[PDB]
Amino acid sequence: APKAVLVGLPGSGKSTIGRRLAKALGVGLLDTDVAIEQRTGRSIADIFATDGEQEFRRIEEDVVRAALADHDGVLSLGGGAVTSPGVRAALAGHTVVYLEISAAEGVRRTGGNTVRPLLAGPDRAEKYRALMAKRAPLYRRVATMRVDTNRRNPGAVVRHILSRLQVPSPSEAAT
Ligand SMILES: [Cl-]
DSSP states (O other): OOSEEEEOOTTSOHHHHHHHHHHHHTOOEEEHHHHHHHHHSSOHHHHHHHHOHHHHHHHHHHHHHHHHHHOOSEEEOOTTGGGSHHHHHHHTTSOEEEEEOOHHHHHHHTSTTOSOGGGGOSHHHHHHHHHHHHHHHHHHHHOSEEEEOTTOOHHHHHHHHHTTSOOOOOOTTTO
């Protein structure tokens, strides 16, 4: 079972924190979005377009269940997995770390390298705030560890998580 399943919105630093965390623990990193493409031979977009959302969500659910069963390291969950009731069921009992950010932090962090994001018009930011309103409540439901990642460096976020994922040395009996 994973040492940690990471969840959060775009902008939360999920990819960089996942890698860093796996590095510090010395464990494997498995990303469910990448795993779906590796198991199907098709892009996320292709599956959506041709089989439809519900079927994408069944395929993802299967992948996530397998990963929770078989992976021992860090599991980075794709952004919409938690909309699936079966995913939220399958997560129960696991260690689930929610990289929590505000709507405003997220907007700022997903603007890219352009210097004047407001000039492209409000639609991208509006769609981002909508997503957060739909996903955030689901992430708070499934979390076992919430981590405030607003204006914190990824290094400090990794330390925070490691301080709360400690494993005692085994007893002589255990050995
Ligand atoms: Cl680190």
